[PDB]
Design an enzyme around this catalytic site. Structure first.
Site, PDB file in Angstrom:
ATOM      1  CB  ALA A 195      -0.942  -0.001   1.202  1.00 45.04           C
ATOM      2  CE1 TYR A 196       4.584   5.188   3.563  1.00 44.78           C
ATOM      3  CE2 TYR A 196       6.669   4.700   2.508  1.00 44.78           C
ATOM      4  CZ  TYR A 196       5.907   5.490   3.335  1.00 44.78           C
ATOM      5  OH  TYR A 196       6.470   6.588   3.938  1.00 44.78           O
ATOM      6  CG  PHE A 228      -7.409  -6.081   3.399  1.00 41.11           C
ATOM      7  CD1 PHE A 228      -8.435  -5.280   3.862  1.00 41.11           C
ATOM      8  CD2 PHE A 228      -7.271  -7.350   3.928  1.00 41.11           C
ATOM      9  CE1 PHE A 228      -9.296  -5.732   4.842  1.00 41.11           C
ATOM     10  CE2 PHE A 228      -8.129  -7.806   4.906  1.00 41.11           C
ATOM     11  CZ  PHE A 228      -9.142  -6.995   5.362  1.00 41.11           C
ATOM     12  CB  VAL A 229      -4.020  -1.072   5.629  1.00 43.76           C
ATOM     13  CG1 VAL A 229      -3.035  -0.776   6.742  1.00 43.76           C
ATOM     14  CG2 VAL A 229      -3.581  -0.405   4.338  1.00 43.76           C
ATOM     15  NE  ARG A 277       0.489   2.867  17.025  1.00 47.09           N
ATOM     16  CZ  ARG A 277       0.273   4.075  17.525  1.00 47.09           C
ATOM     17  NH1 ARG A 277       0.967   4.532  18.553  1.00 47.09           N
ATOM     18  NH2 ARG A 277      -0.665   4.845  16.980  1.00 47.09           N
ATOM     19  CB  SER A 291      -9.499   5.976  -1.256  1.00 45.12           C
ATOM     20  OG  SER A 291      -9.356   5.144  -0.121  1.00 45.12           O
TER      21      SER A 291
END
Lengths: 115, 115
Positions: free
Chosen positions: B13-14, B37-38, B45, B70
């Site tokens: 995702a980054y 999907f985070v 964390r 998004s």
């Protein structure tokens, strides 16, 4: 061989206090150890049952005057990623020895102060 | 057949905001959709990366004036108990259709107000 350990199976952590009370009132035992792994599954809240079990074990040991050692443990996080699974095996392996030492020393001390 | 969708793979995702910026500056696209999907794995964390990704996508879409929708979603709880696994399959199946409808409507409206 001086100390004999009897194993009693139980469906879940909620069923431990009553079993402990029965085994304490029946005599024959100098100490009682109860072990379970209370886990937050991510769907329902788990703290109610853990609080009830801990308080019930304390109440039982105060009622029957038989020491009850707690090896019911609630981890901060457990998401079943096999890393937690590998870690908690060894951690419970350590906790078992710790509980054995605690049980021996508490039984010896209680027998000492009763004279 | 009026709209063609091109798929671009990305390790995590980054890496989405920069890829989106490149694809927006290259032209040829009326909208950009980013899906991930985070997940909180229970060890580290995860909110820092999610916040960075969302803010970066917003900054990119403001910079390049190309809509970016998004579909990066962060569940409250996911412990990999196969119940969450069964649930989120269908939920993402629904979210895909929702995102398609939103993309169509936003592109049509933006083309409308530009005349």
């Amino acid at each position: 061989g001086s100390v004999e350990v009897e194993i009693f199976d139980v469906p879940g952590a909620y069923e431990i206090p009553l079993h402990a009370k029965t085994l304490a009132r029946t005599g024959r035992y100098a100490a009682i150890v109860g072990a379970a792994f209370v886990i937050d599954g991510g769907i329902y809240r788990h703290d109610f049952v853990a609080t009830a079990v801990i308080n019930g074990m304390m109440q039982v040991q105060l009622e029957t005057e038989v020491p009850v050692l707690s090896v019911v443990l609630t981890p901060h996080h457990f998401h079943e990623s096999k890393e937690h699974h590998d870690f908690f095996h060894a951690h419970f392996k350590v906790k078992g020895v710790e509980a054995a030492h605690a049980a021996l020393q508490i039984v010896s001390e209680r027998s000492r102060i009763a004279a």
